[model samples]
Target: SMSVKKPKRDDSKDLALCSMILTEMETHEDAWPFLLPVNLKLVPGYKKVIKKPMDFSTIREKLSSGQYPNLETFALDVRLVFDNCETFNEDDSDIGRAGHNMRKYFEKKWTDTFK
Candidate 1:
């Protein structure tokens, strides 16, 4: 495994270390709302994987339900979408990344079978 180290940004801004950590936290806070249901458009050719069962809009509604109320069910449902859309790269597509993140959040903050 690669050695892990905390990376610091060194740039013209010459930001203080605390500034970087605070900014990172701020960005995380800002992002969660939008990611509640991953946007499909960010991927260059997302429409290729968008079709039936759990197309972007359909998943959006399910996710917007604040999801099924039973957190475990919701997390499972999200994975259903992720697994069905096998054409997407989890590291590349909005759906995959958001799905992963949402599932991660649910597993830790909510409940799950741990997809």
Candidate 2:
């Protein structure tokens, strides 16, 4: 079953991270929001398969490998991917949590199931 958990939020840090992500999105329009969802759904049992941290390069590699068929598929994978990614880190700040929360909101609005 899919779960919806609110991400911890700090307005100031969220704004900064959002701006940074938005700027990066301009170059990687396909991966920004979509790839997160795709990765989440593609991985079995929602296992955190990615060994490296969540970043553009890792996203690019995942996309290029056809992990997600397209951006649309990725949107469905977003929340789960973000949540799983957080597990690998010791210090996920409010900005990070906010980002995860935002993605969760989007994921619920977009997909009916985790798959």
Candidate 3:
């Protein structure tokens, strides 16, 4: 035997509401199923920044070779990018400036380090 149920009203709102409720119920069921296992993972520790011990002759040689010229400016640009990422927002006007500075800094650092 086959039966077709007829709706009591022809309003589109009732059909839309029923569909929306069913979609919501399916989303909830999929997101947090009872059969999944939950485990905690440990976070990694932070690293410290410090200057290395160097001999005066080595420092003089490096300075004579111009190995670290404009290094402070490069470091400042990197710090600016890190700060921007930490304090980012969708509407921040200086975000582009930070990115541009970081790119320029990285290029200079890369050329100096590789050469």
Candidate 2, residue 50: lDDT: 55
Give the per-residue lDDT of model 2 (tens digit) for 1-115.
2687688443444333333443454354234443333355665644455543354445545555657554444443444455655664333665355456555555553443222
lDDT by residue (1-115, candidate 1, tens digit) is: 3787678544333223223422332245323423333455765565555553453344446545544444445445545654554445555676457546644543453222222
TM-score of 2: 0.31
Model 2: weakest 10-residue lDDT segment is 14-23
TM-score, ranked from best to worst = 1, 2, 3
Global lDDT of each model?
A: 0.44, 0.46, 0.35
lDDT of 3 by residue, 16-113 (tens): 33334223322432222111211113212211121222222332344345554444433343343334333332334454454344445444544554
**lDDT for model 3, on a 0 to 1 scale?**
0.35
TM-score pick, better of 1 and 2: 1
Those runs of model 3 whose alpha carbons end farther than 4 Å from true positions after fitting are 1-92
Best by lDDT: 2
